[PDB]
């Protein structure tokens, strides 16, 4: 054949840290369907927001938004525990159906995105050109996000352990841990991966007593 219908850009969802995770790769023939299981980013989350994106960039916001919805009613549980199956299905007419279902609760939400949504031909060519030009920078951004996500988790976990240690944590340890948590929070806002990893290490270095 000399012609066929494709979806012209990758389609996916935003995941923790503001990155795009692809469910359907650019130029996949339609119709097509793909699912992937995700979990929650922080402890006790009862909802997830599904931000549907079209594009090739690793920073979620650099891609085009197709729509968003929340899936609510997840039982609050440790981060990583819920299993939220997200399915993208593009039919032969280009209509994209996205669903998210929490396996434990059975709660499901979905949206239908019309085939005319998303970027036009000129914008599609520009997205592909910009993504190619920024390939290395986007990889470095994904590394930075992986590290911030680890840092953000350590910040929550440590606060949780401080709050659970009560008066069993000596006071001097508490003061050092608090000032380390501040320094880690500050680094997390920056774009320097090594700085975040260093403030993770400095926090670990004052948390030994807390680690019991």
């Amino acid at each position: 054949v000399l012609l066929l219908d494709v979806t012209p850009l990758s389609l996916g969802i935003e995941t923790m840290g503001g990155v795009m995770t692809t469910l359907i790769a650019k130029n996949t023939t339609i119709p097509t369907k793909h699912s992937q299981v995700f979990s929650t980013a922080e402890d006790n989350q009862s909802a997830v927001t599904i931000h549907v994106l079209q594009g090739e960039r690793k920073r979620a916001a650099d891609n085009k938004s197709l729509g968003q919805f929340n899936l609510d009613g997840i039982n609050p549980a440790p981060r990583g525990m819920p299993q939220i199956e997200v399915t993208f299905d593009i039919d032969a007419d280009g209509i994209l159906h996205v669903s998210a279902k929490d396996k434990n609760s059975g709660k499901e939400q979905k949206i239908t995105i019309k085939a005319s949504s998303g970027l036009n031909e000129d914008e599609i060519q520009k997205m592909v050109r910009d993504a190619e030009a920024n390939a290395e920078a986007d990889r470095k951004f994904e590394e930075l996000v992986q590290t911030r996500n680890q840092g953000d988790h350590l910040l929550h976990s440590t606060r949780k352990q401080v709050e659970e240690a009560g008066d069993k944590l000596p006071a001097d340890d508490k003061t050092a841990i608090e000032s380390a948590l501040t320094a880690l929070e500050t680094a997390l806002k920056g774009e320097d991966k090594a700085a975040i990893e260093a403030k993770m290490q400095e926090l670990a270095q004052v948390s030994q007593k807390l680690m019991e």
Binding site: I13, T15, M16, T21, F38, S39, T40, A41, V48, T49
Partner: peptide, 7 residues
């Protein structure tokens, strides 16, 4: 590990 979602 699965990838994570905020919300």
């Amino acid at each position: 590990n699965r990838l994570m979602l905020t919300g």
